């Protein structure tokens, strides 16, 4: 039991999405926002 031997539980620290970081990431160039329209814009989207 050392400071460089402790490990988190399996499946407890899922990595977050990082949008717009190339083709291989699967979220590049649009960040999963589609192509155009109100919902693709920064701060876009309709109220509740």
């Amino acid at each position: 039991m050392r400071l460089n031997t402790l490990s988190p539980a399996e499946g407890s620290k899922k990595a977050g999405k990082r949008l717009g970081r190339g083709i291989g990431s699967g979220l590049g160039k649009t960040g999963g926002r589609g192509h155009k329209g109100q919902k693709s814009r920064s701060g876009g989207g309709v109220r509740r």
């Binding site: 039991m1 050392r2 400071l3 402790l6 490990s7 988190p8 539980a9 407890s12």
Partner: protein
């Protein structure tokens, strides 16, 4: 269970739930991580396009110049512009449930006695506050990197250990999860272990 003393060669009874439970690595890891986060100061900041010193004047007109349209000399695209998501002074401290904190100490203490990294003595003190004496005493016990936990914090023992790098003294109430893991050996007096059991139920 019994904790055999090093000098008196007598056993000391302790709660099996405190010193004899399994090692919950996932639980200990969260508490160790949260302790390091609590040490963060988090004092930093950058300037957004609002805080950068400059004018709100449009650098050149919207159309006709043949250049890319610009609206502010403070834009993050520009050199000397603001930072897009400039940081603010934040607080990185996490919450640890009381039972998860205490549950991690029990898992650490029970792991120490399993690694024979916990040494129990009836008493531990020095006559004068002189680091030469304490350094000699630990050499007799074949200890170099050790955390010493006592019942009552003696000033002489505290002063004698201040200059020793790999040694630190601690009250029974002042133990923390990362200290119990960071040091090679942990020496606890018979009074300290008694006070730790009351702390950990």
């Amino acid at each position: 269970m019994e904790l055999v003393l090093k000098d008196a060669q007598s056993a000391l009874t302790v709660s099996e739930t405190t010193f004899g439970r399994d090692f919950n690595e996932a639980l200990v890891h969260q508490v160790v991580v949260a302790y390091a986060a609590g040490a963060r100061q988090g004092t930093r900041a950058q300037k957004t396009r609002a805080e950068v010193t400059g004018s709100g004047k449009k650098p050149w007109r919207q159309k006709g110049t043949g250049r890319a349209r610009s609206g502010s000399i403070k834009s993050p695209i520009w050199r000397s512009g603001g930072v897009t998501f400039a940081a603010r002074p934040q607080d990185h401290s996490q919450k640890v449930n009381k039972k998860m904190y205490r549950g991690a100490l029990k898992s650490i203490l029970s792991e120490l006695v399993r690694q024979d990294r916990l040494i129990v003595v009836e008493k531990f003190s020095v006559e004068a506050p002189k680091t030469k004496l304490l350094a000699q005493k630990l050499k007799d016990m074949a200890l170099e990197d050790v955390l010493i936990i006592t019942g009552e914090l003696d000033e002489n023992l505290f002063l004698a250990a201040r200059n020793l790098h790999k040694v630190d003294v601690r009250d029974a109430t002042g133990i923390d999860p990362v200290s119990l893991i960071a040091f090679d050996k942990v020496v606890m007096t018979a009074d300290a272990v008694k006070q730790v059991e009351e702390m950990l139920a």
